[PDB]
Amino acid sequence: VDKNCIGWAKEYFKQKIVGVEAKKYAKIKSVSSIEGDCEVNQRGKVISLFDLKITVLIEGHVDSALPFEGSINVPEVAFDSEASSYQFDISIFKETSELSEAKPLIRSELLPKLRQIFQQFGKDLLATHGND
């Protein structure tokens, strides 16, 4: 028998993602959306060809100091993704020549922690509904 773990994946990412963070600094505020599929089917084995789209909202500051907000879209978190597979579309809302230091921040310290999290999900997913 197969099951749709999209509900579980969605709460899993909410706690795995919110709060992660990178004078200059930023952190993941919320998880604004997760779409796609995530099921664990029995096929010989207990396979899963999950494939998800995820967007997170962010906040931070550079510099006295100057804060900002944005979003990060990852078009594909999937059963066959490698660490280098994930794509990150960094948006800094209503940006300015001064805010030109936010993205380099996010790329250097946040993204690499995002990559390891997505990579762990597959393991956690099966060792939770597969060895099941």
Partner: protein, 246 residues
């Protein structure tokens, strides 16, 4: 009787067998530019032999390139969703072990996404050979740009195949990667300018200040490129900046 070519091991197949198989399914009179024959195993099982033609077909973006088999039984040669339209020029065969017969299908989506990734690996191999890439680019550069327009997951990789003239690449087109290598460590953005044609952007006065800083400027002379750039937003960590936005 005949053991289908695509079920055979890529490593054992000769260029001549690939050429004969390509001519057989396409009527082309030329050998294919490149062949990408692979197998996918595991929770998803399928094989494919895909060919990139040496020339664009007369009706590329105007006026059944892939035969879909299921467990070695031919099903159809007109299943869209097997490959996106910007890749419509690819020919060949896809044989799926699992696709359910008679029909949003999940297996089809996985297969499609896997095929797009493999064709991009092929395009990167092609780019490593200037004689081949020249033929590839002159025929399908527009298709590459359309993939950049719509494919959020693969556009960064596709961006590596784009070529443009620049204030430092006047007699040859340059790649974005090479533009980046020529950048001084203090340069943070990749600069480009748009215009109605090469001759006009080439002497635009907005270039003066970039040149005085010795910063290279890419020349984009078509809306399809401008849109490709704003959809990309950045390349290898460097933001794409249009120098006439002010």
């Amino acid at each position: 009787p005949t053991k289908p070519l695509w079920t055979r091991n890529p490593s054992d197949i000769t260029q001549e067998e690939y050429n004969a198989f390509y001519k057989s399914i396409s009527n082309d009179w030329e050998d294919p530019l490149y062949v990408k024959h692979f197998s996918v195993e595991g929770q998803l099982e399928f094989r494919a032999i895909l060919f990139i033609p040496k020339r664009a077909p007369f009706d590329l973006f105007e006026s059944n390139n892939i035969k879909l088999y299921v467990r070695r039984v031919f099903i159809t040669d007109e299943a869209e969703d097997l490959i996106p339209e910007w890749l419509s020029f690819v020919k060949g065969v896809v044989d799926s072990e699992d696709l359910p017969l008679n029909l949003q299908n999940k297996i089809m989506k996985v297969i499609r996404k896997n095929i797009v990734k493999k064709l991009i690996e092929a395009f990167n191999e092609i780019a490593e050979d200037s004689e081949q890439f020249e033929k590839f680019y002159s025929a399908f550069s527009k298709n590459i740009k359309l993939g950049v327009h719509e494919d959020t997951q693969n556009r960064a990789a596709l961006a590596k195949l784009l070529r443009y003239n620049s204030t430092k690449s006047v007699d040859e087109l340059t790649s974005l990667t090479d533009y980046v290598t020529r950048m001084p460590e203090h340069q943070k953005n990749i600069y480009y300018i748009t215009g109605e044609s090469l001759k006009s952007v080439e002497k635009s006065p907005f270039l003066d200040a970039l040149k005085a800083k010795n910063f290279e400027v890419l020349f984009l002379t078509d809306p399809i490129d401008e849109y490709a750039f704003t959809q990309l937003k950045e390349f290898e960590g460097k933001t794409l900046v249009d120098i006439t936005k002010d």
